[PDB]
Amino acid sequence: PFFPPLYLGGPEITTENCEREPIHIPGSIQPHGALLTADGHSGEVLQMSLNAATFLGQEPTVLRGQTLAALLPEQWPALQAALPPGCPDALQYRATLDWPAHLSLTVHRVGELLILEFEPTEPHALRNAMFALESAPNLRALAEVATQTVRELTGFDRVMLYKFAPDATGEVIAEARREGLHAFLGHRFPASDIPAQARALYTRHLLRLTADTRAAAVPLDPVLNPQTNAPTPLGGAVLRATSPMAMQFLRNMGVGSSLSVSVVVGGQLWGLIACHHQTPYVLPPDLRTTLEYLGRLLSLQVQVKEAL
Ligand SMILES: *C/C=C1/C(=C/c2[nH]c(/C=C3[NH+]=C(/C=C4\NC(=O)C(C=C)=C4C)C(C)=C\3CCC(=O)O)c(CCC(=O)O)c2C)NC(=O)[C@H]1C
């Protein structure tokens, strides 16, 4: 059972209680984007990341109480139509906004709350890349093709296929890596390195990232959803702040930027496409959607090859 988060008197997480960190409700985001939450009926802005002015041109206390009908007149109708009450929380509305300078808008619904993520935005290849995954003659070749394809798409310094054993230990079973990096191929890691609540979250929410492993989280205020007087679920928000314990592991590994995609086989977390960059690095939003698609395609191909 989860500890309370830090803003509800919960303890700072240690290695004795890795699995009890409520990573889905950090009440904070990464600073490379802005997050608002809004009432799913009124469009009233209820919560604001403290950096909202950087991206949206208005202070949190000025955005607070304004409606999405006022703030996003061109998107609000489509947004309402796209994400009705009771729709799946995996369902996304996506728009490209003109900003005086594009801004990618990603929206999902959790209960009666809309969660709005704003971050800056920037097939012949992909088709051949899919056919390459399809064409791999065994699981090892599939793993190698998948890591090299993702490295070519992203430019990440390292792309690993990280496979879970039945005891939830992990192993790097393939990797594409920059010249000069030390090999992790064949290295195994304890189950606690990706604790049980992270594995559960990653079965439902298939991509997460840390753009800068040194960056302080930006608070969401007010931190509790005024609808519920309870924490705002951020498991479906790519801007969600990462566990400080996970961020520290990456810094100690010389990793400035991390991104992973779930590999899901018969509804169980099989592994991760796990990416590192030495330098902080914001993967463009369009490249993430492509990487989510490849994760789904890889998941289907892994299920087939392992039966053999
Ligand atoms: C006491 C808690 C600890 C802990 C928690 C923790 N770890 C994650 C997430 C990840 N850990 C990963 C581990 C590895 N990445 C590698 O490259 C290697 C080895 C080469 C390992 C072992 C990975 C891949 C993830 C997923 C996220 C990512 O892709 O960067 C979480 C969840 C983070 C979040 O989503 O907020 C947590 C709570 N890790 C520990 O090592 C102990 C100290």
Q: Is the CB of 3 under 6 A from ligand 1?
A: no
On the question of a cis peptide bond just before residue 219, with omega within 30 degrees of 0, the verdict is: no
Angstrom resolution of this structure: 1.5
Q: Is the CB of 30 under 6 A from ligand 1?
A: no
Give the count of alpha carbons within 13 A of 102, CB side only. Answer: 11
Tell me if 206 sits within 8 A of 236, measured CB to CB. no
Q: Residue 119: beta bridge partners? A: 104
Q: Residue 273: beta bridge partners? A: 161, 261
Tell me if 239 sits within 8 A of 28, measured CB to CB. no
Q: Is 201 exposed, middle or buried (0-12, 13-18, 19+ CB in 10 A)?
A: middle
| Per-domain residue ranges of the chain | 1-120+214-242, 121-213+243-308
Q: Is the CB of 290 under 6 A from ligand 1?
A: no
d(CA 285, CA 44): 26
Give Rg (Cα) of the chain. Answer: 20
CA of 191 to the centre of ligand 1 (A): 10
Of 243, 272, 277, the residue with max ligand 1 atoms within 8 A of its CB, to mutate for a pocket test, comes to: 243
Q: Is the CB of 249 under 6 A from ligand 1?
A: yes
Residue nearest to atom 10 of ligand 1 (CA): 194
